[PDB]
Amino acid sequence: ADCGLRPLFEKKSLEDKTERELLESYIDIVEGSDAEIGMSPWQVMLFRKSPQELLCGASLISDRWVLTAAHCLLYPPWDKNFTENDLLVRIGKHSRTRYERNIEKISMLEKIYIHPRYNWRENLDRDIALMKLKKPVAFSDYIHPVCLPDRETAASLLQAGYKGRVTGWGNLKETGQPSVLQVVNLPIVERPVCKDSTRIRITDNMFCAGYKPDEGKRGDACEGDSGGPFVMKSPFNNRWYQMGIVSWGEGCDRDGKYGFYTHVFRLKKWIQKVIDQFG
């Protein structure tokens, strides 16, 4: 309900640096920026208990719920299939390596919910999963849920050329690692370009994002950024909406190559469905 209003900006009537770019495309990480403190209070770390390592990115939609990629939990081709005892979710972080003493909170998972029809055998269609936290988290200036779009929010922001923003602790290069969360603002590309760019069968639970080889700007998510959110700020009620989930790509910031993201809106119903059956 308080979704998408960052306590250290919107709340205080402060604007972070690249917000303008976002908002000026509505017509008013590889090669990304260092995030500002409290700029993405809904960003989660998906952390492995042993080895103690970061597996993916994620979002905080509720005080009890996290949104990630299905592929984070379960990928048979790679012998990946995690259970809610092999993980710890870290909320309120900035630096990637250190245990930020009194700023971050670490939770245990209560149940994992993969999309019944996630298609790990062909194209990662429906790459979405929900985790429900053992106990609710308290919001602080650094921990705060993002909003989930509605048919008319998804309607009007989700368009070719609109900038959205990606965030992650992942690879800074294909063949680099940050000390601090990174950010990158990328434009939504039309379907046709998305299609003609790869051999994989593009579905509607998908959208692609990146610049063309020709706009003189690069940027992409990369290794370790999975599950993290692709967000947009409605110029209407200026709240942040989670529009996509980092799904798949071909390389990292490869010319004439774009990012594919789960269409959060398209699967919103399944997400309702699971929150009020067992949440």
């Binding site: 208990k49 042993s50 970061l54 390596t97 245990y99 670490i106 690692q177």
Partner: peptide, 10 residues
């Protein structure tokens, strides 16, 4: 590379 976490968390 990771600082250890509250051993109380595993």
């Amino acid at each position: 590379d990771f600082e250890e976490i509250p051993e109380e968390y595993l």
